[PDB]
Symmetry: none
Subunit: 348 residues, 2 copies
């Protein structure tokens, strides 16, 4: 089933919407309607919008192929550039005045405004730095959590998930009870970080416990559809049958995410029911779209491989809950190594 | 357990002692204590020695790294080479006379002496040719067996195990029944060739049937220790548990050999008794010295895989 990026793009809010558009355009492609659709959608989102270099990049990517409206605009670039100079100088002015006047909240907000500014104009390190500089000036829990959330966001945008894990840890270890929405977003970030660091078991454990009510709240990061897909796939590639039963099949909250992706739902059910062929057919049909996913793309093959292995082993052998770690320990390997050996045996 | 080349080398007799020290010094290395002790011993042995080709080889390999008494010796080389030439000429004259006078047994012995001479000089193909050549001069079954034993030894040193097999066959099929020790040695040769030809099951059967009274009498080729090691690992990689119980765990004669190498004995018991991690720990621990084994080296990984595979399957029994 083919992807419609109108509906997909609509799921997302900020820079990530743009990045996902560019990602789709860049690779899978070979299907160029999709490509230049994505390029066009991206062009119009970027134009909105504070970021001149991204505009230039997409303009060079489209390359006049879409006509006059999708070509280069010098007016726009110059204007945006100058207004940036202006509001920048205004910023630094105000902050010098605040630091000097010794007003805590205004210094925090000053730095934060700077972060907003560089994030917007697209310079990510400077935004991170400035967001992080607000620690000392935080009066309230809300301020600290706000700092962590921004640092998480920009870390993600720059691809440091180690950092994301750090700032999740920072915010989470705050002794104060947090709004459950905030916790939902924290669990999302940790899950995503784990996914991108290839710790799938941990990824899945995080996603499966995300608050059902999250909906689109975390839109500038993730969509409920992603939570179901990543949670489901990671679980299937990681969990033994017991844990799959406890934290997926019988997890009523997670059903709300699953209902959003019935293919993934049926596929997981197929697997738990030991219909392995059906499961694998479904994954085959899903492979293209999954390959279109900025976050999941690098993990598609590993996860598919893992699920196929677990399938082979369950199907062919004298364990349904397969005590694989017991054997791994008997053979002085990891479970994934053992899985390689076993697949060799089972298939020849 | 870290290898001591002294004990190991002391186990063997002729050319093979040397070939072993050289094989050792050539691979594992990273351990240059090992390398240097091996080179030194090789040099010392080779020097005893009719083979200046070997000598120049080890001199080059060492490259003056053992200092002044481990390098080139021109006087030694000259003396050895000259003595050889004198010898060769004497042997040529004799054999020529024997051929001229039609003296069967002298012709036979003549070609045989050339065989010996060539072997000492390090020229293996020539040696092989003369030893085989004695075939046309054989009056007796002993003669046949003598030629076979020489042919076998030289083929092993030339690493041609197809020939080893031939001369093993010839020997084995003697209408006359063979002496026990010759039989034992032949089992050893056959096992060796099977091992090189990557047929481990046959190799194992051969080695497992070797008469425990052979001891060090085959030292030019194999040691009792090697018989245990090759027998054990080959069987373990090859045999079903029935055969492994019968021919190995319950084989009392072979127990004599297995005694000599406890780690391998225990490795086999651990495998049989299905304590897998123990087994693989032993294999892990032996892997280095097995890789130093001039004959077993190439087979190590394969045998290891085979063993491991079997273990996995054993594990899946309910």
């Amino acid at each position: 089933e083919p992807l419609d990026i109108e509906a997909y793009a609509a799921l997302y809010k900020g820079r990530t919407k743009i990045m996902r558009l560019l990602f789709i355009a860049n690779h899978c492609g070979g299907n160029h309607a999709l490509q230049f659709d994505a390029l066009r959608m991206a062009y119009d989102e970027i134009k909105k919008g504070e970021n001149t270099q991204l505009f230039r990049e997409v303009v060079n990517k489209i390359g006049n192929r879409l006509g006059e409206k999708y070509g280069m605009d010098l007016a726009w670039c110059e204007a945006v550039d100058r207004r940036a100079e202006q509001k920048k100088v205004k910023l630094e002015n105000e902050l010098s005045s605040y630091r000097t006047n010794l007003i805590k909240e205004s210094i925090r907000m000053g730095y934060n405004d700077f972060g907003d500014f560089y994030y917007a104009c697209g310079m990510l390190g400077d935004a991170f730095k400035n967001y992080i500089r607000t620690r000392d000036y935080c009066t309230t829990t809300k301020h600290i959590i706000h700092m962590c959330m921004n640092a998480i966001l920009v870390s993600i945008e720059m691809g440091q998930f180690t950092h994301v894990t750090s700032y999740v840890n920072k915010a989470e270890q705050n002794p104060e009870t947090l709004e459950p929405m905030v916790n939902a977003k924290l669990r999302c970030a940790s899950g995503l970080a784990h996914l991108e660091l290839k710790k799938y078991k941990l990824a899945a454990r995080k996603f499966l416990d995300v608050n059902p009510e999250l909906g689109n709240s975390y839109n500038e990061v993730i969509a409920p559809q992603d939570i179901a897909t990543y949670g489901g796939l990671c679980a299937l590639a990681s969990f033994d049958r017991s844990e799959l039963k406890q934290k997926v099949i019988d997890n009523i909250n997670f059903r709300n995410f699953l209902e959003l992706v019935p293919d993934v739902r049926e596929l997981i059910n197929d697997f738990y029911s030991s219909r392995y062929a059906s499961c694998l057919e479904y994954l085959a049909s899903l492979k293209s779209n999954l390959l279109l996913d900025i976050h999941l793309h690098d993990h598609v093959d590993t996860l598919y491989d893992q699920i196929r292995k677990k399938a082979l082993i369950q199907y062919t052998l004298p364990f349904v809950s397969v005590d694989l770690s017991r054997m791994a320990d008997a053979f002085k390997t990891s479970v994934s190594g053992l899985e390689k050996e076993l697949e060799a045996l089972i298939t020849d």
